[PDB]
Amino acid sequence: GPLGSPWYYGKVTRHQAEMALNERGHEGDFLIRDSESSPNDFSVSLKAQGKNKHFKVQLKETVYCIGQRKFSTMEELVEHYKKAPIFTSEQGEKLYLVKHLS
């Protein structure tokens, strides 16, 4: 729900997010949506080859929590994963966030 928060795409479901990413997205494009299975939290949905990825972001007492990392704002979370991988395979393929889907 946040107004005045350009990081927030919308309250699209997982399947609706997959459709938008496949229809208009390029590798590295992503969107941030409410989580369907944990409604007070968020999901980062990433356009990736083969199968798109979805990552959990918990909002706990103002702090944005992803994996073992903590960020004061969603914007800083996004900036971190533009330069550090958000996903690494066991064979070394790394994925980064590039830009928000419009």
């Binding site: 990825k53 979805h54 990552f55 992803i66 994996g67 073992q68 990392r69 958000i86 996903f87």
Partner: peptide, 9 residues
Amino acid sequence: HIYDEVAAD
């Protein structure tokens, strides 16, 4: 709904 693992840190 299974979520993908975030890269280790």
